[PDB]
């Protein structure tokens, strides 16, 4: 798969998944509002706390950290591609042509409901993201040996990565074992991913995906040494079925390392 991700277009991917219709957060029944709600509700329990946190396979997105950022002071974002990391930095610095995550930032404020303004939220996130590093979940030591990243992390967040870089179940399983080592025993893992998806586009690139079920994700979290605190499913409605992929649903898992 690694070679397929070489033709990956960050802007095409962002437009396919974070721009209307999926990027229209006005409909409370959309996938965006759901993902944000899961993340928000989870961090609102105050069980996922700590000093450091790592985002595995950040890609060119930041929504996966909006609620998280206020509970951890050292945030590490990662990704296998220079192009993505470049895109991340473009938003982190507020340079020209960064992607606009304001609609997302705003809804995270809505959902959390602490009266915070979206600029302060975006400001906090940009402040707590200390670094954007390269990563390969396939290497049994994903980040490397002398990674500038604090290890082990207190928590982990990963959205649409593992199943999007694994040819089959076993690879998905090992990939989890790999990143799972980056997590402190007792730490927390927040995994978001596609259910029963087998491909999705990113411009000229056509990525292969491993179709997984909710049950298969659960058993994989256990086999990796986690206590599944929560695991819910979102069924992709017709209006959000657009051709950019064949995803059937989206899963959210809150897992704690034994």
Ligand X SMILES: N[C@H]1CCc2ccccc2[C@@H]1O
Q: What x/- string results for residues 153 through 192 when contact with ligand X is judged by CB under 6 A?
A: -------x---x----------------------------
Of ligand SAH, ligand X, none, which one does residue 61 interact with (CB within 5 to 8 Å by kind)? ligand SAH
H helix intervals, the chain: 10-17, 31-43, 82-93, 102-112, 118-128, 169-180, 214-223
Q: Check if the beta carbon of residue 195 is closer than 8 Å to that of residue 160.
A: no
- In angstroms, rounded to a whole number, what is the distance separating the alpha carbons of residues 252 and 40? 12
For position 61 contacting ligand SAH by CB under 6 A, the verdict is yes
Six-digit token pair at 66? 């909006």
Residue with tokens 């992390």: 153
In whole angstroms, what separates CA 173 from the centre of its chain? 17
Q: Smaller CB distance to ligand X: residue 45 or 100?
A: 100
Of ligand SAH, ligand X, none, which one does residue 22 interact with (CB within 5 to 8 Å by kind)? ligand X
- Residues 120-139 close enough to bind ligand SAH by CB under 6 A: 135-138
Helix axes 214-223, 169-180, angle to 10 degrees: 40
| Interface stretch with ligand SAH, choices 24-32, 39-47, 93-101, 154-162 (CB under 6 A) | 154-162
Residues at the annotated binding site for octopamine?
197, 245
Residues at the annotated binding site?
13, 18, 57-58, 63, 79, 84, 136-137, 159, 197, 245
């Amino acid at each position: 798969v690694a070679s397929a991700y070489q033709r990956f277009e960050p802007r095409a991917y962002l437009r396919n998944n974070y721009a209307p219709p999926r990027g229209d957060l006005c409909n409370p029944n959309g996938v965006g509002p759901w993902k944000l709600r899961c993340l928000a509700q989870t961090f609102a329990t105050g069980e996922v706390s700590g000093r450091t946190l790592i985002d595995i396979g950040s890609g060119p997105t930041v929504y996966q950290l909006l609620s998280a950022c206020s509970h951890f002071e050292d945030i590490t974002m990662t990704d296998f591609l220079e192009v993505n990391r470049q895109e991340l930095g473009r938003w982190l610095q507020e340079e020209p042509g960064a992607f606009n995550w304001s609609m997302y930032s705003q809804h995270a404020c809505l959902i959390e409901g602490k009266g915070e303004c979206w600029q302060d939220k975006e400001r906090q996130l940009r402040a707590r993201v200390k670094r954007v590093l390269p990563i390969d979940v396939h290497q049994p030591q994903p980040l490397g040996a002398g990674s500038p990243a604090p290890l082990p992390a207190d928590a982990l967040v990963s959205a649409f990565c593992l199943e999007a870089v694994s040819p089959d179940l076993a690879s998905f399983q090992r990939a989890l074992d790999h990143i799972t080592t980056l997590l402190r025993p007792g730490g927390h893992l927040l995994l978001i991913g596609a259910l029963e998806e087998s491909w999705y586009l990113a411009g000229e690139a056509r990525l292969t995906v491993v179709p997984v079920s909710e049950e298969e994700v659960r058993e994989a979290l256990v086999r990796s040494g986690y206590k599944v605190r929560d695991l819910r499913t979102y069924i992709m409605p017709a209006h959000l079925q657009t051709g950019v992929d064949d995803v059937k649903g989206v899963f959210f898992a809150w897992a704690q390392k034994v």
